[PDB]
Amino acid sequence: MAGPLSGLRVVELAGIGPGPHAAMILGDLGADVVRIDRPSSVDGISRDAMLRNRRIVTADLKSDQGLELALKLIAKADVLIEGYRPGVTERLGLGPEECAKVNDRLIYARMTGWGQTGPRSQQAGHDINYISLNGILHAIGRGDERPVPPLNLVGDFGGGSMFLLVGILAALWERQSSGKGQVVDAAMVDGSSVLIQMMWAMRATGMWTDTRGANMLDGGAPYYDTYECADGRYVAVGAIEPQFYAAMLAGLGLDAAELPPQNDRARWPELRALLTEAFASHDRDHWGAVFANSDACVTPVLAFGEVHNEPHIIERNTFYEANGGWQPMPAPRFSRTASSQPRPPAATIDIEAVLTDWDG
Amino acid sequence: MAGPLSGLRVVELAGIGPGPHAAMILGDLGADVVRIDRPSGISRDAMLRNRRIVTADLKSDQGLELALKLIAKADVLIEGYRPGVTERLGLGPEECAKVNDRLIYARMTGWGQTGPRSQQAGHDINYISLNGILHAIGRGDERPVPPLNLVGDFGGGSMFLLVGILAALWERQSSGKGQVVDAAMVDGSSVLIQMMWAMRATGMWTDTRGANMLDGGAPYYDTYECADGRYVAVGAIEPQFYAAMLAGLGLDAAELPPQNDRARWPELRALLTEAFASHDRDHWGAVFANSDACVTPVLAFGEVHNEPHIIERNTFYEANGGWQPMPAPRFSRTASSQPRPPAATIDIEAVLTDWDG
Numbered sequence: 001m002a003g004p005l006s007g008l009r010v011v012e013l014a015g016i017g018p019g020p021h022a023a024m025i026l027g028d029l030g031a032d033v034v035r036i037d038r039p040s041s042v043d044g045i046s047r048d049a050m051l052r053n054r055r056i057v058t059a060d061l062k063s064d065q066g067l068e069l070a071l072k073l074i075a076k077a078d079v080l081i082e083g084y085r086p087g088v089t090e091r092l093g094l095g096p097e098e099c100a101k102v103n104d105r106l107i108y109a110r111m112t113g114w115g116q117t118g119p120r121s122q123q124a125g126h127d128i129n130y131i132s133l134n135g136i137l138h139a140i141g142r143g144d145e146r147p148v149p150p151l152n153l154v155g156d157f158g159g160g161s162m163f164l165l166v167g168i169l170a171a172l173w174e175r176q177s178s179g180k181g182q183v184v185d186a187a188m189v190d191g192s193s194v195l196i197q198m199m200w201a202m203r204a205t206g207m208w209t210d211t212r213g214a215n216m217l218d219g220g221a222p223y224y225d226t227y228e229c230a231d232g233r234y235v236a237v238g239a240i241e242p243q244f245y246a247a248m249l250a251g252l253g254l255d256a257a258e259l260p261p262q263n264d265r266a267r268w269p270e271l272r273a274l275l276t277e278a279f280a281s282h283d284r285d286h287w288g289a290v291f292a293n294s295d296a297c298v299t300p301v302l303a304f305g306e307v308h309n310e311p312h313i314i315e316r317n318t319f320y321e322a323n324g325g326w327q328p329m330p331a332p333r334f335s336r337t338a339s340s341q342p343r344p345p346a347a348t349i350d351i352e353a354v355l356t357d358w359d360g
Numbered sequence: 361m362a363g364p365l366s367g368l369r370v371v372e373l374a375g376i377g378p379g380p381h382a383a384m385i386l387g388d389l390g391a392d393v394v395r396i397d398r399p400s401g402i403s404r405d406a407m408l409r410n411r412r413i414v415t416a417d418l419k420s421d422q423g424l425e426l427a428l429k430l431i432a433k434a435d436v437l438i439e440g441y442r443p444g445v446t447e448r449l450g451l452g453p454e455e456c457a458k459v460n461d462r463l464i465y466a467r468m469t470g471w472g473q474t475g476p477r478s479q480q481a482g483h484d485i486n487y488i489s490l491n492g493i494l495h496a497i498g499r500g501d502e503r504p505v506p507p508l509n510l511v512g513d514f515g516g517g518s519m520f521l522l523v524g525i526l527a528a529l530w531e532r533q534s535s536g537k538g539q540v541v542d543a544a545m546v547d548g549s550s551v552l553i554q555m556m557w558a559m560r561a562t563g564m565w566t567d568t569r570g571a572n573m574l575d576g577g578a579p580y581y582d583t584y585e586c587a588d589g590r591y592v593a594v595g596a597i598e599p600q601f602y603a604a605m606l607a608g609l610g611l612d613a614a615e616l617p618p619q620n621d622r623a624r625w626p627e628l629r630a631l632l633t634e635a636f637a638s639h640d641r642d643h644w645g646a647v648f649a650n651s652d653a654c655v656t657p658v659l660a661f662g663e664v665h666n667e668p669h670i671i672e673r674n675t676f677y678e679a680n681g682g683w684q685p686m687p688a689p690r691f692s693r694t695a696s697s698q699p700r701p702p703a704a705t706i707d708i709e710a711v712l713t714d715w716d717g
């Protein structure tokens with residue numbers, strides 16, 4: 001199996017959202033990932049490309065046999081991922097303490113939103129709930145409208161799965177010294193809060209306010225925002241640094257002498273009006289050409305369906321084709337132990353065949 | 361130094377955005393992080409917590425030499441400059457492999473190491489514009505809105521650099537060697553959004569903005585304005601949670617269009633808008649506490665310190681000006697400690713003494 005995590009063995013108790021995303025990335029980087037779903041599901045080969053780089057197996061964990069075949073896999077594995085409410089694995093007899101008895105090297109990875117304890121620990125939730133409580137959601141969107149969810153990118157993935165991954169891999173490093181596993185408690189409310197640590201730092205130094213749409217990076221700055229073009233499509237401007245901003249202005253055909261200063265926030269309404277009228281005078285692909293090799297920080301805002309035509313995307317093979325659509329190649333990239341193209345989802349496998357393959 | 365990464369040594373060449381963030385998290389989890397800045401008081405950027413800062417003109421002979429001495433003693437090097445920059449300093453991968461064949465050489469860029477955009481300046485908003493992400497964010501009648509810099513720099517940036525550094529350290533235990541980790545934000549952010557690429561393939565996600573289950577188009581996955589002008593979030597995807605939300609709103613499910621009849625979503629949204637608008641945020645927070653309705657108050661940063669669930673799990677600690685997030689995630693046996701504030705600049709020889717030779 002190709003990639004830096006070759007030899008790593010992973011047992012994933014099937015869930016939704018961050019847990020399968022984390023499991024995917026371990027698989028992506030070479031890990032041997034075994035996913036235990038309930039038979040209630042099954043039903044053929046999965047259409048969900050997030051379940052790539054997996055072996056799938058069936059098991060009623062509520063039964064005695066299920067529980068024991070599962071504990072057999074866990075006994076022979078480096079990592080367990082579960083993303084159920086707190087107490088589910090305990091009551092099932094797959095809790096940490098029970099796993100510690102059959103394998104004290106195990107990294108026991110717990111993926112939740114609210115965490116393992118506290119008042120909200122038993123409430124159902126999704127990404128939007130977790131980022132609502134820690135100030136993130138309130139900061140996203142235009143000032144003149146209600147907050148808009150940044151899909152499920154910030155709580156589920158950036159502040160969820162990715163912190164689970166770091167925990168798993170950090171614990172594997174620790175196990176090199178200690179000879180012992182441990183429990184990783186990844187909560188989306190905490191992970192997403194560390195993801196936005198910059199804003200908490202700037203807030204303390206007065207460089208970020210709680211007013212939505214009135215900061216440097218939330219759309220409030222005319223030089224960090226999107227602009228509608230003549231064709232109704234968009235470009236993105238990110239020209240924070242003065243030397244990039246000056247390059248953007250020159251490409252737009254605006255003389256700096258006729259504009260207010262870049263960072264005179266009292267005159268941001270005028271500046272936005274000027275930039276708005278300028279960008280609106282030609283179509284997106286015009287601006288794309290004008291700025292193509294520049295430091296002006298102006299890029300076309302592409303829709304998913306257009307991404308496969310962008311030369312830079314094509315040439316670095318960011319994407320690969322699979323089953324009526326592109327999918328992202330693994331990230332990040334490794335010079336010596338490169339990842340391979342992901343294996344598509346396969347048919348289920350018997351849990352015994354796996355215990356056998358894993359030496360048994 | 362507390363945490364699972366005790367005894368990991370990290371040299372960080374100072375930059376902006378994702379590199380400092382990755383360094384921070386390594387520090388948070390107990391790595392020994394030395395940050396080389398350029399000689400041009402104590403830094404009040406709390407993202408520079410859990411560091412030792414040294415200055416060195418990396419363009420001088422003595423600065424280069426001192427730096428290669430650090431790197432020789434270290435496990436990981438982080439750099440976030442345009443491609444070519446470290447090479448010309450004499451700090452490229454191959455120069456470093458001469459003094460330390462075990463080094464994890466971690467390169468954090470937006471566009472990657474090669475290709476037509478590899479020398480273009482850029483920020484978060486640019487990297488997410490090219491791969492479909494930015495286009496998908498915001499309301500349908502408006503131009504796309506940047507989700508701060510959370511998706512390109514941090515989620516699809518620093519976090520993938522971390523996954524790469526830590527996976528490479530695992531590979532190192534079996535091979536005895538380091539390697540180069542190439543983390544591009546355009547790549548990481550695309551994997552971060554793999555769920556949308558999956559759903560587009562199964563015909564369950566559209567390129568139309570504001571028209572999808574998770575982009576704000578769904579009336580049961582969106583924010584709602586309350587009687588006081590503050591907001592709740594609703595995330596009631598599962599029918600059983602959705603039903604519970606409707607009951608607590610006082611709405612009879614028989615009077616409403618089906619949850620997932622998308623042609624009638626505008627109608628359903630109008631009905632939920634009127635209901636949520638009739639009480640204030642805190643009323644709804646109370647009504648739905650301990651429920652699976654997936655309704656939560658949308659707090660602004662300055663309110664977060666007063667929320668019971670936040671306080672009791674110590675998600676934050678107080679620093680100088682105000683609150684900062686504690687390290688994440690959390691570990692049973694080797695627990696992170698509270699971050700050390702940004703220290704005063706120390707001399708680079710001191711560090712070398714500390715590190716043996």
Ligand SMILES: CC(C)C(=O)SCCNC(=O)CCNC(=O)[C@H](O)C(C)(C)COP(=O)(O)OP(=O)(O)OC[C@H]1O[C@@H](n2cnc3c(N)ncnc32)[C@H](O)[C@@H]1OP(=O)(O)O
Pocket residue numbers: 015016017018036037038039059060061062083084085088092111112113114123124125126127128152156597
């Ligand atoms: C991708 C989109 C949708 C997002 O934005 S996702 C973020 C979703 N939230 C989370 O994952 C946070 C943590 N998880 C949760 O809060 C909850 O799993 C959830 C998502 C709210 C779903 O709640 P529920 O459906 O009440 O499930 P849970 O409380 O986790 O319990 C799982 C049940 O499955 C049972 N289970 C799980 N696997 C098995 C197998 N293989 N066999 C038998 N029983 C099983 C388990 O025993 C539980 O049954 P009960 O005994 O009846 O309680």
Ligand SMILES: CC(C)C(=O)SCCNC(=O)CCNC(=O)[C@H](O)C(C)(C)COP(=O)(O)OP(=O)(O)OC[C@H]1O[C@@H](n2cnc3c(N)ncnc32)[C@H](O)[C@@H]1OP(=O)(O)O
Pocket residue numbers: 240374375376377378396397398399416417418419440441442445449468469470471480481482483484485509513
């Ligand atoms: C604003 C935030 C919040 C975001 O949204 S951040 C995401 C920003 N983008 C990135 O970091 C992607 C990768 N980095 C870059 O593209 C570029 O660094 C940048 C951000 C566009 C800035 O470009 P520049 O200021 O031209 O810097 P670089 O090209 O990286 O080169 C840095 C120079 O500093 C020099 N340098 C660096 N450290 C030192 C020290 N210690 N001593 C002396 N000289 C030094 C280095 O040798 C380079 O010199 P030259 O190539 O000979 O000019």
